[PDB]
Design a protein around this ligand. Structure first.
Ligand SMILES: C[n+]1cn([C@@H]2O[C@H](COP(=O)(O)OP(=O)(O)O)[C@@H](O)[C@H]2O)c2nc(N)[nH]c(=O)c21
Ligand SMILES: [Mg+2]
Ligand SMILES: [Mg+2]
Ligand SMILES: [Mg+2]
Lengths: 23, 126, 223
């Protein structure tokens, strides 16, 4: 209903980021 | 009224950007919020750096295209140049920028439309 | 670097950093703008007033008034700022707050946290809910935020104490079996100064904990 923290504050965890083969 | 707010918005934005980096000339585009990450090679894992802020695709007085993140968590901002568009990759929900000196930065843009638009601008800008 | 920067240049920065380029989803209401004002205040107090000592320490209400009279987007609310700010903290004191009452393996001691300023009293690790996150995810987010301990594998969503202090709904999940050797440390920039255990018998049947002492003791005697 009411919130104190926006969505962009909940940035995805570091594990979510992709790992392409060249990394 | 919508265009008036955009005029005052870009005016204050540009004045603040010039306040931190006087070499900046204009603002090409803006993303509402971007979380920055760094991929640790040798550790083979992504590190979440606390650089969260507004994203400013800018151009300096020497025609160099770069981007500035006004970090909301600390005064340490992030100003990085894009010397060639083949260093930015649209992979999954993130952009992967390989800086000139073999640094891998991962930008997560809160707005997916901002991700696609920023990515397409960089791919067309050079 | 604000090492020497006028208060106007500071307010210009804080405008472009927290207010003027927000996502449109929360730039529609007035209270939602004031929550970013509170974020810009913590930045000004902790960071900007640390590179330029000449800048004054301002209360949240005073700082908001200066920034509302400064940023052109906010000029509409500058005259009715006292009433709009009254609506802001009237809004904030109604957000649901979730936390966890972490009991030890003997169920005779609990984990309490103390606020940053030395005057602030003790209380359970709790915090306000964010947009669209669940009550349990909120309790996990804020207990990890204020004590650095992850209770996701330990929280029981069916075992909680629901309270409505004033207009603020507070829910604290009872998590027993927390070992006394477990390490605690806050992961915020302020807000939490101390984290210690307290004997439940040593609590007053200062603290904002009293309301939960009646249900908690009945819950422990059951087990
Ligand atoms: C993260 N943080 C929290 N505080 C203080 O923490 C108090 C509660 O802030 P809160 O984070 O909204 O609490 P909650 O989510 O746990 O319910 C405020 O009164 C602030 O003074 C903070 N105060 C300053 N100056 N800077 C910060 O970064 C900061
Ligand atoms: Mg709290
Ligand atoms: Mg908290
Ligand atoms: Mg918080």
């Amino acid at each position: 209903i009411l919130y104190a923290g926006p969505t962009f504050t909940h940035s995805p965890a570091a594990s979510n980021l992709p790992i392409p083969t060249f990394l | 009224a919508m265009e008036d707010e955009n005029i005052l918005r870009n005016a204050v934005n540009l004045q603040v950007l010039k306040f931190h980096y006087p070499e900046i000339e204009s603002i090409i585009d803006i993303a509402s919020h971007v979380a920055v990450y760094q991929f640790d090679v040798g550790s083979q894992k992504w590190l979440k750096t606390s650089i969260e802020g507004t994203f400013f695709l800018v151009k300096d007085q020497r025609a160099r295209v770069g981007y500035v993140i006004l970090n909301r968590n600390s005064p340490e901002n992030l100003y990085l140049f894009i010397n060639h568009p083949s260093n930015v990759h649209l992979v999954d929900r993130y952009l992967i920028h390989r800086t000139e000196n073999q640094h891998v930065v991962g930008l997560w843009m809160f707005d997916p439309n901002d991700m696609s638009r920023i990515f397409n601008i960089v791919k067309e800008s050079l | 670097s604000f090492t020497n920067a006028t208060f106007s240049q500071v307010l210009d920065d804080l405008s472009a950093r927290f207010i003027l380029n927000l996502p449109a989803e929360e730039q529609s209401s007035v209270e939602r703008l004031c929550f970013q004002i509170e974020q810009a205040h913590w930045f000004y107090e902790d960071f900007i007033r640390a590179q330029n000592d000449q800048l004054p320490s301002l209360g949240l209400r005073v700082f908001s008034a200066k920034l509302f009279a400064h940023c052109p987007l906010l000029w509409k609310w500058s005259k009715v700022h006292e009433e709009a700010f009254d609506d802001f903290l009237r809004y904030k004191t109604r957000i649901p707050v979730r936390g966890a009452i972490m009991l030890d393996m003997s169920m005779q001691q609990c984990v309490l946290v103390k606020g940053w300023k030395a005057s602030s009293g003790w209380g359970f690790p709790k915090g306000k809910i964010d947009k669209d996150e669940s009550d349990v995810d909120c309790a996990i987010r804020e207990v990890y935020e204020e004590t650095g301990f992850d209770c996701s594998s330990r929280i029981n969503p069916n075992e909680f104490i629901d309270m409505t202090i004033r207009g603020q709904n507070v829910r604290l999940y009872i998590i027993p079996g927390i070992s006394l050797d477990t390490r605690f440390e806050s992961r915020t920039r302020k807000e939490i100064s101390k984290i210690e255990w307290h004997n439940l018998m040593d609590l007053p049947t200062f603290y904002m904990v009293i309301p939960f002492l009646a249900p908690l003791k009945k819950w422990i005697k059951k087990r």
